Amino acid sequence: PFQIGKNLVVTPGEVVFRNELIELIQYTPTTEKVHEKPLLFVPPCINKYYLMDLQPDNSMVRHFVGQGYRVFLVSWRSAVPEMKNFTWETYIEKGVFAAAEAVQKITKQPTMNALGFCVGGVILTTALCVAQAKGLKYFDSATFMTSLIDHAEPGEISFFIDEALVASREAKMAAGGIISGKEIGRTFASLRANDLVWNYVVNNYLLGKTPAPFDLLYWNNDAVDLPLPMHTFMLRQFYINNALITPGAITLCGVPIDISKIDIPVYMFAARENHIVLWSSAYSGLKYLSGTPSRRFVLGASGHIAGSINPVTKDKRNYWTNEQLPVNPEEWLEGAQSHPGSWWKDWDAWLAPQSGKQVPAPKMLGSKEFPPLQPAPGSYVLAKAMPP
Amino acid sequence: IGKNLVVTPGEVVFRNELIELIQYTPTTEKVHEKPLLFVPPCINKYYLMDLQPDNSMVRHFVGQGYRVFLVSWRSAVPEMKNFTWETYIEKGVFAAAEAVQKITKQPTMNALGFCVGGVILTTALCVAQAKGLKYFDSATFMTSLIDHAEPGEISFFIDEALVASREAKMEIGRTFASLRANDLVWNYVVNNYLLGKTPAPFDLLYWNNDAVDLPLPMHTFMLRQFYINNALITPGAITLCGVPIDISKIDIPVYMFAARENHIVLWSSAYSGLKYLSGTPSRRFVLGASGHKRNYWTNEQLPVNPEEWLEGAQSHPGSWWKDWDAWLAPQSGKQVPAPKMLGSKEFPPLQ
Numbered sequence: 001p002f003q004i005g006k007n008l009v010v011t012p013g014e015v016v017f018r019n020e021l022i023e024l025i026q027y028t029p030t031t032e033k034v035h036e037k038p039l040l041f042v043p044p045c046i047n048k049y050y051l052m053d054l055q056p057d058n059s060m061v062r063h064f065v066g067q068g069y070r071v072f073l074v075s076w077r078s079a080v081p082e083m084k085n086f087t088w089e090t091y092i093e094k095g096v097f098a099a100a101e102a103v104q105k106i107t108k109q110p111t112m113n114a115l116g117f118c119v120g121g122v123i124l125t126t127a128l129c130v131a132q133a134k135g136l137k138y139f140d141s142a143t144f145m146t147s148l149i150d151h152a153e154p155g156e157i158s159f160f161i162d163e164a165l166v167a168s169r170e171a172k173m174a175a176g177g178i179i180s181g182k183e184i185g186r187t188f189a190s191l192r193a194n195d196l197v198w199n200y201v202v203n204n205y206l207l208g209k210t211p212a213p214f215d216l217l218y219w220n221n222d223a224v225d226l227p228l229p230m231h232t233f234m235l236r237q238f239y240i241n242n243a244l245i246t247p248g249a250i251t252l253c254g255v256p257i258d259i260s261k262i263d264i265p266v267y268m269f270a271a272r273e274n275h276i277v278l279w280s281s282a283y284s285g286l287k288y289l290s291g292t293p294s295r296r297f298v299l300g301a302s303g304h305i306a307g308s309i310n311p312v313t314k315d316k317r318n319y320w321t322n323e324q325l326p327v328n329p330e331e332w333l334e335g336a337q338s339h340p341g342s343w344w345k346d347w348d349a350w351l352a353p354q355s356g357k358q359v360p361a362p363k364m365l366g367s368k369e370f371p372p373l374q375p376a377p378g379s380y381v382l383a384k385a386m387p388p
Numbered sequence: 389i390g391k392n393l394v395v396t397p398g399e400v401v402f403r404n405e406l407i408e409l410i411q412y413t414p415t416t417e418k419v420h421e422k423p424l425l426f427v428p429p430c431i432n433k434y435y436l437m438d439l440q441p442d443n444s445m446v447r448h449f450v451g452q453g454y455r456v457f458l459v460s461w462r463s464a465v466p467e468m469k470n471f472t473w474e475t476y477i478e479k480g481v482f483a484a485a486e487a488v489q490k491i492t493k494q495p496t497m498n499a500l501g502f503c504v505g506g507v508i509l510t511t512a513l514c515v516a517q518a519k520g521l522k523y524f525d526s527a528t529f530m531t532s533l534i535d536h537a538e539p540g541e542i543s544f545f546i547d548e549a550l551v552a553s554r555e556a557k558m559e560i561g562r563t564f565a566s567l568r569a570n571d572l573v574w575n576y577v578v579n580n581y582l583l584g585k586t587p588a589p590f591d592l593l594y595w596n597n598d599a600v601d602l603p604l605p606m607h608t609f610m611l612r613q614f615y616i617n618n619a620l621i622t623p624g625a626i627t628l629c630g631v632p633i634d635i636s637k638i639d640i641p642v643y644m645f646a647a648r649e650n651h652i653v654l655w656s657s658a659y660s661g662l663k664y665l666s667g668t669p670s671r672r673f674v675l676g677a678s679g680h681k682r683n684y685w686t687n688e689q690l691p692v693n694p695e696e697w698l699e700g701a702q703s704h705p706g707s708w709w710k711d712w713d714a715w716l717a718p719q720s721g722k723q724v725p726a727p728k729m730l731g732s733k734e735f736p737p738l739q
């Protein structure tokens with residue numbers, strides 16, 4: 001079968017910092033010299049983090065650490081009665097900023113290139129806004145994988161969101177409970193399963209029969225839990241009210257949030273054959289990044305799981321790129337240039353000049369201040385959902 | 389695909405609401421007295437090699453001198469939508485066995501069940517021994533799965549969300565991301581586990597075949613009780629005709645064959661299903677290789693690891709039909725002249 005410790009997530013690394021919410025993983029360098037500026041990974045909290053580190057073939061973590069990047073990662077902890085009152089402000093505070101400060105203290109570097117996936121892109125961009133409000137110089141690059149900045153025009157998720165349940169949870173906002181992985185599966189995992197199966201059958205109609213990706217389904221079936229305040233806040237303020245398009249309509253961590261302020265070069269990727277959330281909704285966000293000096297958009301060939309994770313060592317499908325950014329997405333698609341092989345290479349190039357010069361890889365994991373606690377994958381990833 | 393193949397003669401000797409019994413015209417002077425029954429899947433056209441378009445196997449074994457009968461399941465009609473698995477056991481296998489024992493005047497018979505049909509036979513056995521009904525003296529399973537632990541690629545698709553989605557079916561801007569059991573995927577699973585030839589999505593059989601015409605209760609029962617629950621390996625997990633299903637209660641010799649290159653049915657899984665037939669007096673497993681000629685592997689040892697069985701297996705070139713012929717000939721009784729009439733007086737031959 002699939003054991004997390006043994007045949008998955010085998011990318012060597014150590015837990016160099018642990019929180020009451022997260023577990024930072026510094027991956028063991030596999031190159032002689034790495035890029036000086038580190039690379040932080042912000043995986044989603046809907047499911048578990050290891051979609052980027054499945055098998056050494058399709059392990060994006062092992063790949064990018066194999067290219068020469070100081071790869072760090074945020075491992076989210078499944079919900080627990082200890083975390084019943086956690087909110088979005090805590091996932092920004094004790095989540096993103098904690099790991100960022102930890103990387104700054106380990107690598108002794110000021111800036112870092114960041115990457116957000118699914119919901120980790122929303123947490124990432126909110127952390128970028130609070131990072132531009134308080135003068136916190138943490139990131140010099142940003143990247144968003146299949147994440148929605150504009151949540152108006154959402155996906156099929158709206159068909160499975162209960163307004164009365166969100167309101168009833170707003171009635172008991174204080175001392176909130178814990179959202180079971182079953183419901184989050186009804187809203188996310190099941191639909192990604194439908195799109196993965198459908199797109200797999202389609203790819204078996206176009207090309208010859210390809211081996212079925214059981215690792216993807218195993219990542220999708222391994223569900224975690226989430227606190228009630230943060231999840232209810234997500235369903236209320238994003239997938240319903242959509243407070244990201246209205247500057248100042250939302251306020252967390254004592255800060256109002258406007259997207260135009262972000263002045264960090266942004267790279268955005270969005271799967272094309274993504275039926276659960278069409279790529280037009282993801283492309284409908286770059287027009288709100290007016291303050292960003294640089295912007296990039298890349299169309300991914302397959303679905304959410306299959307297209308989000310395409311290994312370079314395989315180079316299975318293509319991707320579309322062009323610098324133009326019109327208001328209509330079809331105008332972007334017409335003047336788009338197609339490139340074979342997986343899209344990661346492109347982002348690799350997009351990170352080459354930003355990562356600065358090269359520096360010999362640190363032959364010591366962690367630091368004198370942060371001792372390696374336990375080897376990767378760690379403990380939080382091995383958590384099991386709470387029984388009924 | 390431009391096929392030039394022989395026809396196998398046979399008349400209909402028994403008919404009912406669900407099946408049709410076909411008695412094949414004997415071509416040997418002296419045939420074995422004990423008859424031989426064929427149990428295909430509960431599908432009129434399964435498109436399995438050597439059987440559906442050509443039926444070379446029945447022709448060969450009638451050539452070896454056997455009184456061969458076949459259970460031709462009728463095509464799906466609106467009157468068959470209410471049948472269940474207990475009906476396919478009751479009016480399906482047992483009724484055909486009664487027809488054979490009345491036409492041939494012989495009490496017992498040798499049973500053969502390939503593909504999903506074999507599974508049916510299995511369940512039927514666990515009912516017969518439970519009700520004291522003596523129908524079969526031996527059973528044979530060809531490319532059939534008793535232990536559904538490792539179904540193979542099809543496990544990527546089958547789950548409760550799929551079967552529940554198809555049970556639902558049976559809305560202005562939503563795509564197929566909310567309809568899992570669409571006709572494409574559902575037909576891929578059904579055609580993938582119920583047919584000996586897998587049609588391409590651009591084929592007419594991919595969308596209109598007998599497997600898609602099978603009643604939904606049968607698909608729910610097979611996908612849930614077997615491919616999801618694996619109720620066969622667990623004693624008493626399912627109850628059919630008011631009988632708990634215990635594989636250890638099979639008291640007849642068992643022969644099992646599984647093609648090595650069949651990626652639909654892993655021969656390691658069919659071999660895995662052997663350790664659960666502890667009550668059977670003897671078990672013989674034979675692995676068959678297509679040869680890109682033909683050859684097979686025999687081993688009378690039965691370890692738990694399949695690769696260990698293959699390591700010590702003796703390779704015999706040719707068709708494995710010789711091996712099953714030597715395994716089946718002693719259990720077929722003496723030799724009697726061939727019956728010049730198909731069926732009997734009380735059972736006149738239909739058309």
Ligand SMILES: CC(C)(COP(=O)(O)OP(=O)(O)OC[C@H]1O[C@@H](n2cnc3c(N)ncnc32)[C@H](O)[C@@H]1OP(=O)(O)O)[C@@H](O)C(=O)NCCC(=O)NCCS
Pocket residue numbers: 429434435436437438440441442502503504531581582583584585586649650651652653
């Ligand atoms: C036989 C099998 C391995 C073919 O796989 P394959 O290599 O893809 O070949 P195809 O399915 O395209 O079949 C190709 C050949 O088989 C022949 N063929 C296919 N079905 C046939 C049949 N029912 N009878 C006779 N010949 C057949 C043709 O020769 C065709 O062309 P070729 O001779 O030039 O190769 C595959 O069909 C199979 O084994 N299916 C088993 C079904 C099953 O396991 N069912 C579960 C029990 S129902």
